[PDB]
C-alpha cells in the first residue's frame, strides 16, 4: 500500500540525501536518490581506504538476511566512479521493507564529489534498462513486491533554501498536492533509460537586450535528474546562453556571474508540452565557496552527451515538483508550493 515518505537533507543546494537501512538487524546509511542512474551501492566493510573508514560501511557478516552474489560491478558517473562486487539483502525506506535487493559493495571510489560526500552511496531511480549488471533497481523491486499498491509513481520535492529545516522528500507511491500549486503538466518518456523526454524550446528574454536568446530552437531532448545539481546542456548552446547572461569561464566546469549584478539577470524558460517553465536568477544562480572565495555560479553548464540532451537537475527540480510515473512512462511537472 504505502505511500512511503523519504525525508531529504539539503547540503548547500548541491546535493540531497536521505536515510536507508540494509540488512537484519538494520545497518543505517545516507544515500543520494538519483533519477539519473539505476544502481544501489554502499561502501563495503571489506574496504579499509580513507574513504571507507570515514563513511558508513555495509557488513554482510552481521546480517542474517544477506545473500552472496559476488559479480564485479563498475559504474561511471559524471562526477565520479565506483567499483566493487554485488550482494543482496533487505533494503528499508521508511516503513517499506524491500526484500532481496541487490546492492553494490564498493571497494574503489573515485571523484571528490563522492569521496568527500556527506552521503555513503547512491540509490538509483532510473529505468532498469541502464542498471549495471542488470540488477533490479530498488523502485522496480518495490513494484514487483506490490508495495505501492496501484500507484507506481514517486514524486520529488527539493527545497531550494538550504537555511530551511526540511531539505526535500522522495514520496514513494504517491503525489502530494501539498507540495505543488496549480495542475500537473505531463510529458511522455521517449527513450526508457534515463527519465528522458522531448523539450519544445529554451529561451531568455531580457528587458535590457534588444534581442532574445532562443535555444533548443528546433526542439531537443532532456532528462529529469535529481542527482545532477545544475542544468546541463549541449556545450554550444550553453556557451551562448551564458554569453547572453554575462557568464564567463577561464577555468573549471562552470560559468561565473558577477555577484553584484545578479538582480539584472533575465529569467530563463523551458517550454515542455507547450507550457512555459520559468527560472528566475534566484532559481538558477548557485552560491559556491571555493579556494577561500564566494562565487556566483551560473546554473547552466555544458555537458556533451552521446546524443545531445539537457539534464534538468536540482536547479529545475526544486521550483518544479516532479512526478516520475512508471505506470504510464511519463514525467509530470508542477509549480512547487
Amino acid at each position: 500500500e504505502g505511500p512511503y515518505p523519504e525525508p531529504l537533507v539539503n547540503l548547500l543546494d548541491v546535493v540531497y540525501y536521505g536515510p536507508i537501512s540494509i540488512g537484519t538487524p538494520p545497518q543505517d546509511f545516507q544515500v543520494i536518490f538519483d533519477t539519473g542512474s539505476a544502481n544501489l551501492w554502499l561502501p563495503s566493510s571489506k574496504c579499509t581506504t580513507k574513504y571507507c573508514l570515514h563513511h558508513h560501511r555495509y557488513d554482510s557478516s552481521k546480517s542474517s538476511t544477506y545473500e552472496a552474489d559476488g559479480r564485479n560491478f563498475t559504474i561511471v558517473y559524471g562526477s565520479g566512479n565506483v567499483e566493487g562486487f554485488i550482494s543482496k539483502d533487505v533494503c528499508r525506506i521508511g516503513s517499506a521493507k524491500v526484500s532481496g535487493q541487490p546492492l553494490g559493495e564498493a571497494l574503489v571510489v573515485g571523484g571528490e564529489s563522492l569521496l568527500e560526500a556527506p552521503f555513503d552511496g547512491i540509490l538509483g531511480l532510473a529505468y532498469p534498462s541502464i542498471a549495471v549488471d542488470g540488477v533490479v533497481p530498488v523502485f522496480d523491486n518495490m513494484m514487483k513486491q506490490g508495495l505501492l499498491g496501484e500507484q507506481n509513481v514517486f514524486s520529488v520535492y527539493l527545497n531550494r533554501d538550504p537555511s530551511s529545516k526540511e531539505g526535500g522528500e522522495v514520496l514513494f507511491g504517491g503525489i502530494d498536492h501539498d507540495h505543488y500549486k496549480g495542475s500537473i503538466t505531463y510529458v511522455p518518456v521517449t527513450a526508457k533509460g534515463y527519465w528522458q523526454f522531448h523539450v519544445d524550446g529554451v529561451k531568455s528574454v531580457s528587458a535590457s537586450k534588444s534581442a532574445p536568446e532562443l535555444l533548443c530552437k528546433d526542439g531537443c531532448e532532456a532528462i529529469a535528474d535529481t542527482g545532477t545539481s545544475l542544468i546541463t546542456g549541449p556545450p554550444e548552446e550553453v556557451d551562448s546562453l551564458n554569453q547572453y547572461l554575462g557568464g564567463t569561464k577561464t577555468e573549471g566546469g562552470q560559468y561565473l556571474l558577477d555577484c553584484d549584478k545578479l538582480e539584472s539577470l533575465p529569467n530563463v524558460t523551458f517550454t515542455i508540452s507547450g507550457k512555459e517553465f520559468s527560472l528566475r536568477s534566484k532559481d538558477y544562480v548557485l552560491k559556491v565557496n571555493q579556494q577561500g572565495q564566494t562565487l556566483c555560479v551560473s546554473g547552466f553548464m555544458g555537458l556533451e552527451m552521446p546524443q545531445p540532451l539537457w539534464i534538468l537537475g536540482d536547479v529545475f527540480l526544486g521550483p518544479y515538483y516532479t512526478i516520475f510515473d512508471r505506470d504510464q512512462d511519463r514525467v509530470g511537472f508542477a509549480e512547487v508550493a
Binding site: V76, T226, T228, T232
Partner: peptide
C-alpha cells in the same frame, strides 16, 4: 556541483 551515470 555534481552530475550522477554515463
Amino acid at each position: 556541483x555534481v552530475v550522477x551515470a554515463x
